[PDB]
Design a protein around this ligand. Structure first.
Ligand SMILES: Nc1ncnc2c1ncn2[C@@H]1O[C@H](COP(=O)(O)OP(=O)(O)O)[C@@H](O)[C@H]1O
Ligand SMILES: Nc1ncnc2c1ncn2[C@@H]1O[C@H](COP(=O)(O)OP(=O)(O)O)[C@@H](O)[C@H]1O
Lengths: 258, 258
């Protein structure tokens, strides 16, 4: 079987039924015209944000990663591993796709450990075992993986979805496409940056252009690029007309160079 | 491979770390002393109840089944398919059990359709395909299945966990044990009823002894009993000393006769 293709979803995508429909239309088209098996990895995006906002719970970040107190891991796991994951599975079913929902701990696909006590239940994702997912792909299923994980001691961990995607890409030796609200990484004028290298990323970070989770996202993409030995794309899920070509390789956002 | 054994969990079990530890201890012991593969099916129990109570959301029932409005299916799916499911997966990991979390729609294990428009997003569970779960069992995994499902049109459905367990038992041709807060079905004096037949169940329901979801639970157990052609047990998860023998066959609650 070929190296799979991981398409990572997140942001406010789940807030738009229209965007979800156009996305799944493109997913079905990709599947029915390619031999490379697909794998979806997703974060919490608007599902978690809106819930937290509704529960009047603050969202604080420390170096791009949002602090996840022990008294909130259950509700976040619910919104991320539960609501977001199952909503995506429902869209897959609606489009006659046989999908299987998983989280990072299933089949020890991605190994997770506590990243920093100051962050609480935030996990550090590293490559795991590709056996379970490889078996699902062989059997014709579309794995849909949430960014929640668990330590060997049984503690639930909230993992940055981009870092989770990169860790799974390494695990599966898969190509990777990170879909976000914006068209890749933006420069100081808010314009799309076509190509990215570690050297340029360092400069942009130094200049304050790349900040917050974007630092985590770019570093993750760069990590995947060097590990896989090939480019990783960061692009938008907003423009339907662009999805088919993007999935097939047309550069629509920021190409992270290995 | 042998007919698997489904152990259904629910109630306030997840509110007790002690009960969860003693349960998983018994699960590990069962696994390491039996060739029959285990499968866990679970409901939302206290996880959903406490969340709803906290969100000041009412919990209304109609014939034992709780009404699930469209504006609540997402949060319930989160608590049930997300929090409850992953908490159980965390306990499994903690006990070195290789488990895989699933919901009713994965591999179309259990087919779900809307039960009644008056109930909202409440699903009717019927036998599905045993292929996915059979493959996981063959590969050495412990499937942990939540009672959330999805219709072919992509609508998420909240399914009574006992009915979900029975539907999966039929699907897999599995033995079944339903664990609850109380020791089986209680009579008018609140005493345990050792054995149950359809005839006796009809009488107890007529007398107002069996009510609410217990009507759903007993009817579900009776349905499984007649379909499988063998007895189904309803017992408690509260007394640790009783678990090992129960899992091996000792009658500790109410045995539903086929
Ligand atoms: N240089 C940058 N280029 C692009 N986005 C950036 C940059 N610096 C910070 N960001 C922030 O990163 C956000 C996207 O990352 P994130 O919030 O994690 O959501 P997502 O990946 O789903 O789009 C943008 O909405 C923006 O606010
Ligand atoms: N005849 C009966 N025997 C036993 N339990 C009954 C009976 N009639 C009603 N019940 C109700 O059923 C409850 C158990 O079912 P349920 O609430 O669905 O939780 P669970 O199955 O996790 O124990 C008991 O707590 C009791 O309030």
């Amino acid at each position: 079987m070929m190296n799979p293709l991981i398409i990572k979803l997140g942001g406010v995508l789940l807030d738009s039924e229209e965007a979800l429909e156009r996305l799944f239309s493109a997913l079905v088209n990709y599947r029915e015209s390619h031999q490379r098996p697909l794998v979806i990895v997703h974060g919490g995006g608007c599902v978690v944000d809106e819930l937290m906002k509704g529960l009047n719970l603050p969202v604080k970040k420390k170096n791009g990663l949002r602090v996840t107190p022990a008294d909130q891991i259950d509700i976040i796991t619910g919104a991320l591993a539960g609501t977001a994951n199952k909503t995506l599975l429902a869209w897959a079913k609606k489009h006659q796709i046989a999908a299987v929902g998983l989280f990072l701990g299933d089949g020890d696909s991605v190994k997770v450990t506590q990243l920093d006590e100051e962050l609480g239940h935030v996990g550090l994702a590293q490559p795991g075992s590709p056996k379970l997912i490889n078996s699902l792909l062989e059997n014709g299923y579309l794995p849909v993986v949430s960014s929640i994980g668990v330590t060997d001691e049984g503690q639930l961990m909230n993992v940055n979805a981009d870092q989770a995607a990169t860790a799974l890409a390494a695990t599966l030796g898969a190509d990777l496409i990170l879909l976000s609200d914006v068209s890749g990484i933006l420069d100081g004028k808010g314009q799309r940056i076509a190509e990215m290298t570690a050297a340029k990323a360092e400069q942009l970070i130094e200049q304050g252009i790349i900040t917050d989770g974007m630092i985590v996202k770019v570093n993750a993409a760069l990590d995947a690029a060097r590990t896989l030995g090939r480019p990783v794309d960061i692009a938008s899920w907003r423009h339907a007309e662009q999805l088919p070509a993007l999935f097939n390789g047309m550069p629509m956002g920021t190409r992270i160079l290995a």
